[PDB]
Amino acid sequence: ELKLSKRLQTVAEYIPNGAVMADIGSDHAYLPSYAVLNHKASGAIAGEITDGPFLSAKRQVEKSGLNSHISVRQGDGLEVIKKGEADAITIAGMGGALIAHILEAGKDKLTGKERLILQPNIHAVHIREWLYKERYALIDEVILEEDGKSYEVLVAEAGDRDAAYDGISLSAGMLVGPFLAKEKNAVFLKKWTQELQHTQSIYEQISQAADTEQNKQKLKELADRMELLKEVID
Ligand code: NI
Numbered sequence: 001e002l003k004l005s006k007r008l009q010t011v012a013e014y015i016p017n018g019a020v021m022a023d024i025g026s027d028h029a030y031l032p033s034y035a036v037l038n039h040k041a042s043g044a045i046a047g048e049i050t051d052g053p054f055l056s057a058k059r060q061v062e063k064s065g066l067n068s069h070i071s072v073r074q075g076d077g078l079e080v081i082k083k084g085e086a087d088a089i090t091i092a093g094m095g096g097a098l099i100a101h102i103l104e105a106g107k108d109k110l111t112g113k114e115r116l117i118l119q120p121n122i123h124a125v126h127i128r129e130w131l132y133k134e135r136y137a138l139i140d141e142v143i144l145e146e147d148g149k150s151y152e153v154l155v156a157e158a159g160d161r162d163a164a165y166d167g168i169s170l171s172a173g174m175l176v177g178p179f180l181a182k183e184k185n186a187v188f189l190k191k192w193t194q195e196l197q198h199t200q201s202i203y204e205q206i207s208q209a210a211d212t213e214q215n216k217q218k219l220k221e222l223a224d225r226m227e228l229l230k231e232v233i234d
Helices: 006-012 030-037 053-064 097-104 125-133 170-176 178-182 185-206 211-234
Strands: 019-024 041-048 071-073 088-094 115-120 137-146 149-157
Touching: 006 088, 006 115, 006 137, 006 149, 019 030, 019 170, 030 041, 030 053, 030 071, 030 088, 041 053, 041 115, 041 149, 053 071, 088 097, 097 115, 097 178, 115 125, 125 149, 125 170, 125 185, 137 178, 149 185, 170 178, 178 185, 185 211
Parallel strands: 019 041, 019 088, 041 071, 088 115
Antiparallel strands: 115 149, 137 149
């Protein structure tokens, strides 16, 4: 039927069976269509913010004759869902900052029991910080690459926020991923090894620059980051 990318395929696998899912900023409503068609989800909501992506999602769902189980809605983030409407929420193809913003702006729509499957393009840390604060528990993480690009997928549900971080510092865990850190797969090492190298270059770059209170502060943070990364790729 519909084919999904490795990235969204990964996301779909965490959808609880018979779950009603809400895909925020749904890409053509493919993921939700795919989930409902494969009976992974019982029903779904596909949220779009702009007119274009909205009409096109509505048309695909209509074209696919999935209007009966899929509701394409227009709105900002979780603005499209009603409290206790969905059992799983997927937010992918966005930056960690946005995802965290979406979650925070619409946490009124959350009961807390909904399973969150978040796929940040970058700065997954913003999501972990938000999750820890709203006490959620990370139940799993995956990091893979597709078409020469690495992508992370975070899965969370109500639970004990510290559990997943047992054995690792919140500081590091939140940045690289507690589960990811334990796994230490090729994609993970490559991503963070490069990040560290990039951090060192800025450190040495700022090092040669002026000796100002500002640059020394900027260096302190780079150092903290470097040591942090060093501890995760040992
Ligand atoms: Ni960020």
